[PDB]
Nucleic acid binder design. Structure first.
Ligand SMILES: [Zn+2]
Length: 665
DNA sequence: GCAAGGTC
């Protein structure tokens, strides 16, 4: 049988598609084999050496520690021996273990990042011979990249491996201990056993939602005033908002008074042609943001649809931060694949506006292991509309990036009020060449109605208004805008961000208020408890500091052992200081879950704090009265008018509106 | 039991 083979080198890939692609790169007829119901590949013909290519399935090993508190040591163990979720990995473990027995040497061909180095290391270490190990380094999954990596096989980068291991240790230490400190404190106080968690990523994310929700529910809009004018010039009546703001309504009224009756004169005309840049290809964060804005799909669902499309061979590997396509990726093969599909009409358009040359508009962000998300060229069949909407975004985004920047004709009129130092512009845009706007057609570009003015034309300011504008709070969070905030803060990875948000929901820390996501009462107190006794775990700075130490490990500037001991010092010091207050923590937690029931606020479910009000409803009144004074000085309105306008604004925090409502009776 | 991180 063809699948019998001896004296080969064992090439370990991170996933089954990567293994297949490597096998296809090294032989034109690689041998498909099957054992423990896992596919693997034999190469009998690559330059007179034998190779077996076997996929892992993500991590096959994970840290495992003792039970109890606190625990400052853990061991790598088979994931299936500890986690019944990842029982899926056992058959991969068994296959690789079997194949390692006859192998002459081992090559880690997992993805070229910190986690890939660890996955392959632990597999070779525990199932193979780490003394006979080498590394394959490729940043894309093309034959050229793979065969070049294969030719340039090097020794293991232990600095990269140790950074990866350090990341696991740090996250295990803080995640497990602090999560246990939460559960153990409640257990000793309330004699209740509930699942509570904290972590380097999930907890700064919870606190962000909680802090924003607090400031928002306490927000009072403050008033400012701007002036708009009516300009009669020739057949035209122009309504112009003057770029000047006023705190006091009286100085806005004096400004408007000084503009009315004055003459305005066109002093400059500029006809300029602007290029509107075509988009770059998607990274997962861009795709999540766009799919959210255009279709309302949640970032966790976008991640899993993108995965299904990639498992179907329709798009490249989606868990990528890159917005770049490297030169080893055949654009021609994608375009001609998309020609043999329903997109051929758009391809013909791209071929037209480019003169037949497809140049990717390379984005800024990179990824060491993968290029940006792009269609493979394979034509889809039987995509439910939800999976087609994602595929179409990716394909039109890629096709748009290989097309042409759009051309805009801007007519800009500079008008000056004669007898006053005030200039202001009036402009309309007309789209010369839509170009990518017809391909990635998810961008509305406003073409105003043309206005024909000439240098020397004059008009009168015949009217105007003082316009009030009320200040605005921070916006509410959606799952996608939270995703965006995490990426912006460098929390999580393309894979974990969606999932970690869903963890915060499953722990009942956050919940869905329709479109939005809002903290629960449990979430509120967990943020407070964690900021009080474990503030490091609640700041995005912990990830920044950890990333910095990890880059030092990767570059030979520090030892993993130091970083872990330092981490243990900080955690333990908090652990010591914690288990004195550990019954207050359980107490706060007991209140958090509604076990210590309490006297409720006059207006909500929170615990009353002063004058019959919870601490936030009390602060809402303090802040309201301060604001009401500011409104008085600025607007000259009477008290009832101020309240009723504050009660009218969607910007007004809920807690404030409860008090205003009451003040109005 | 709990993290964050791979992938299924
Ligand atoms: Zn209250």
């Amino acid at each position: 049988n063809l699948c019998n083979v001896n004296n080969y080198y064992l090439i370990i890939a991170e996933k089954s598609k990567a293994a297949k692609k490597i096998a296809e790169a090294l032989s034109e007829k690689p041998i498909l084999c099957r054992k423990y119901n896992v596919s693997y590949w034999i190469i009998k013909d690559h330059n007179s050496s034998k190779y077996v290519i076997v996929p892992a399935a993500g991590h096959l090993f994970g840290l495992k520690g003792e039970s109890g508190f606190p625990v400052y040591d853990a061991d790598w163990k088979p994931l299936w021996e500890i986690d019944k979720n990842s029982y899926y990995t056992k058959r991969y473990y068994q296959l690789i273990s079997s194949l390692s027995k006859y192998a002459l040497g081992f090559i880690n061909a997992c993805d070229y990042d910190i986690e890939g180095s660890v996955i392959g290391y632990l597999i070779i270490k525990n199932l193979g011979d780490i003394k006979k190990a080498k590394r394959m380094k490729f940043s894309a999954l093309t034959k050229s990249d793979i065969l070049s990596a294969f030719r340039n096989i090097s020794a293991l980068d232990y600095d990269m491996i140790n950074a990866g291991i350090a990341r696991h240790k740090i996250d295990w230490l803080w995640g497990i201990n602090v999560s246990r400190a939460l559960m153990i404190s409640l257990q000793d106080f309330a004699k209740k056993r509930v699942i509570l968690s904290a972590g380097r990523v999930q907890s700064p994310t919870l606190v962000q939602v909680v802090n924003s929700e607090i400031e928002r529910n306490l927000f009072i809009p403050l008033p400012k005033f701007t002036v708009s004018i009516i300009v009669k010039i020739k057949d035209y009546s122009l309504n112009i908002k003057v770029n000047k703001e006023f705190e006091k309504i009286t100085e806005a009224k004096e400004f408007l008074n000084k503009l009315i009756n004055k003459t305005v004169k066109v002093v400059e005309v500029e006809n300029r042609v602007r290029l509107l840049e075509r988009p770059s290809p998607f990274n997962l964060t861009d795709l999540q943001i766009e799919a959210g804005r255009i279709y309302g799909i949640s970032p966790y669902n976008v991640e899993r649809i993108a995965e299904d499309l990639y498992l179907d061979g329709l798009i490249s590997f989606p868990r990528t931060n890159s917005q770049k396509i490297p030169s080893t990726i055949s654009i021609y093969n994608i375009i001609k694949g998309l020609e043999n599909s329903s997109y051929r009409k758009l391809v013909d358009l791209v071929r037209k506006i480019t003169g037949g040359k497809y140049v990717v508009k390379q984005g800024i962000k990179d990824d060491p292991a993968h290029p940006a998300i792009h269609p493979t060229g394979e034509a889809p069949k039987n995509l439910p509309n939800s999976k087609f909407k994602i595929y179409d975004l990716i394909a039109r985004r890629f096709l748009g990036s290989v097309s042409a920047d759009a051309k805009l004709s801007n007519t800009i009129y500079t008008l000056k009020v004669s007898d006053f130092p005030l200039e202001f512009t009036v402009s309309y845009t007309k789209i010369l060449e839509r170009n990518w706007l017809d391909i990635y057609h998810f961008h509305n570009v406003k073409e105003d109605k043309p206005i024909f003015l000439s240098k020397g034309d004059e008009g009168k300011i015949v009217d105007g208004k003082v316009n009030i504008s009320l200040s605005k709070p921070t916006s509410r969070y959606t799952k996608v805008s939270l995703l965006k905030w995490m990426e912006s803060s460098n929390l999580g990875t393309e894979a974990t961000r969606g999932r970690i948000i869903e963890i915060l929901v499953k722990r009942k820390y956050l919940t869905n208020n329709g479109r939005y996501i809002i903290p629960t009462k449990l979430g509120f107190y967990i943020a407070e408890i964690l900021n009080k006794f474990f503030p490091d775990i609640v700041d995005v700075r912990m990830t920044a500091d950890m990333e910095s130490k990890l880059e030092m490990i990767k570059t030979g500037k520090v030892l993993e052992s130091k970083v872990i001991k330092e981490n243990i010092e900080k955690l333990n010091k908090f652990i010591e200081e914690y288990k004195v207050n550990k019954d207050k923590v359980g107490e706060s937690l007991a209140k958090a879950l509604g076990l210590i029931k309490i006297v409720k606020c006059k207006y909500c479910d929170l615990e009353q704090y002063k004058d019959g009000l919870c601490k936030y409803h009390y602060e809402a009144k303090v802040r309201l009265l301060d604001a009401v004074e500011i409104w008085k000085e600025r607007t000259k309105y009477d008290h009832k008018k101020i309240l009723k306008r504050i009660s009218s604004s969607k910007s007004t925090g809920k807690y404030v509106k409860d008090i205003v409502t009451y003040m109005l009776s």
